[PDB]
Amino acid sequence: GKITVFAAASLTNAMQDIATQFKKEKGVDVVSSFASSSTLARQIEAGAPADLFISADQKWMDYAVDKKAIDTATRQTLLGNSLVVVAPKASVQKDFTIDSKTNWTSLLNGGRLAVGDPEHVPAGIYAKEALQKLGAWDTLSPKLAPAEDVRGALALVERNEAPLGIVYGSDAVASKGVKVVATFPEDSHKKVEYPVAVVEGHNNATVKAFYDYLKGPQAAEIFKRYGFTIK
Numbered sequence: 333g334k335i336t337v338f339a340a341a342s343l344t345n346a347m348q349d350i351a352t353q354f355k356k357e358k359g360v361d362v363v364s365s366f367a368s369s370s371t372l373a374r375q376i377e378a379g380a381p382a383d384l385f386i387s388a389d390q391k392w393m394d395y396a397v398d399k400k401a402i403d404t405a406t407r408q409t410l411l412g413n414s415l416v417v418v419a420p421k422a423s424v425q426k427d428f429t430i431d432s433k434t435n436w437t438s439l440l441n442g443g444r445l446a447v448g449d450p451e452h453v454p455a456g457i458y459a460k461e462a463l464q465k466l467g468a469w470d471t472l473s474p475k476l477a478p479a480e481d482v483r484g485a486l487a488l489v490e491r492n493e494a495p496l497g498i499v500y501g502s503d504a505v506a507s508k509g510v511k512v513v514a515t516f517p518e519d520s521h522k523k524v525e526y527p528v529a530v531v532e533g534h535n536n537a538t539v540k541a542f543y544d545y546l547k548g549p550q551a552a553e554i555f556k557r558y559g560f561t562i563k
């Protein structure tokens with residue numbers, strides 16, 4: 333048959349490699365749809381036919397669970413990640429530490445801070461939480477360059493349309509055109525976690541085979557290579 337995976341945008345590269353490998357060794361076609369975790373959860377709620385859902389936060393998985401769209405016994409935290417600040421590869425921007433007294437205004441210099449839309453994209457929600465805890469939010473809000481998902485934010489920095497952008501550590505590994513210039517302290521935000529679950533009514537042997545593969549060694553190898561931490 334064919335499996336349909338709805339996965340957070342930050343999983344783009346890893347999921348494509350995993351799908352390729354699974355087809356080589358098991359013969360099944362895996363089709364992935366990538367977007368903000370919020371967008372995917374709402375599509376699943378509406379009735380879009382996804383078999384698996386992997387969210388970049390617990391919030392949007394909880395959302396789908398409440399709408400009775402998830403086979404709950406299958407829900408499990410699969411990956412972890414870090415929150416970082418990236419700059420264009422060829423930028424002269426130097427490394428910096430992030431604390432209560434970081435001078436964001438000087439760092440930006442009339443430029444905007446690329447972020448996933450803090451209204452709903454997990455990467456933006458983690459970022460807003462961190463910036464509010466570090467007291468930088470009030471200063472930064474009028475200087476944001478929001479995007480549809482974390483990869484949209486990444487693109488803004490790669491195309492040098494924003495001096496800095498807040499993305500996941502894994503995004504930096506996948507990107508050929510940016511560099512990590514700072515890392516948020518773990519205590520500034522909720523732990524970045526990626527729950528996976530089978531969509532209600534799609535728990536059959538074919539989907540289950542893929543779900544099990546995601547927790548196996550071949551997949552763990554690919555996830556690690558892309559900067560994700562395995563839970």
Ligand code: MOO
Pocket residue numbers: 340341342343367368369370387388448453454455456480481482483
């Ligand atoms: O759902 Mo994302 O990976 O925070 O854009």
